[PDB]
Symmetry: none
């Protein structure tokens, strides 16, 4: 049991497996607001002393590859990380062409709120991806 951090939520959106080390790293990233890998590593080891710098580096790189993080050099030469932008619109994917079709459905969002409510929850986020082939 743990709080799902904003970065962890992005990971879950991508269907990534949340191991203990990835969870710690996601939490550290969420609580930082443009750390470099050393900063992420020091903060992660403060939570789990046996997390290695290699593991931290590989994890932030994977997050970057899956567009969960963006990486930039702000001048000092260090690679620094932030939450990547997220789309407001949900997507329909044409799986044959690998093309994205944006859509918005206030109706489907109202239903998603109702589902949360029925289960005793207030909705704080959602991601829907549809997969299609042309008619």
């Amino acid at each position: 049991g743990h709080m799902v951090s904003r970065i962890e939520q992005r990971c879950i959106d991508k269907g990534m497996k949340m191991t203990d080390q990835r969870r710690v790293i996601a939490q550290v990233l969420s609580d930082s607001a443009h750390p470099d890998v050393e900063e992420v590593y020091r903060r992660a080891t403060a939570k789990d002393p046996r997390i290695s710098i290699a593991t931290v580096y590989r994890t932030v790189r994977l997050f970057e590859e899956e567009s969960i993080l963006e990486r930039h050099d702000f001048g000092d030469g260090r690679a620094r990380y932030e939450e990547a932008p997220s789309e407001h619109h949900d997507h329909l994917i044409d799986v044959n062409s690998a093309r994205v079709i944006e859509f918005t459905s206030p109706e489907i969002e109202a239903l998603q709120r109702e589902i949360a409510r029925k289960h005793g929850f207030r909705l704080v986020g959602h991601r829907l991806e549809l997969y299609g082939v042309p008619l």
Copy 2:
């Protein structure tokens, strides 16, 4: 042939009578049994089935993605057949607990959305994130 047994066959898994009994127990269960309930029900069918065989078999069915190990809100590992279509997920952001749900209602809207853009819907992934009221 139980539903679980058929999954095993499709995956080319070695099947024996003891594995079939365990598969049958899982398939026939009205609740979502934990390993203790699987063992008790399996030994009632064949008393030669060991507690060790039960753990190994459920863990094998896990490793092979035929079974899903899941916390339904009681902190217990309970088992469910891996569904014909992925269940949608409502994630409690306070605990990371996943509530699996189905909504024929949302699915109808999903098909309509696909249809209006000129597509047949072939799958979806939906994650909801909530805090307890």
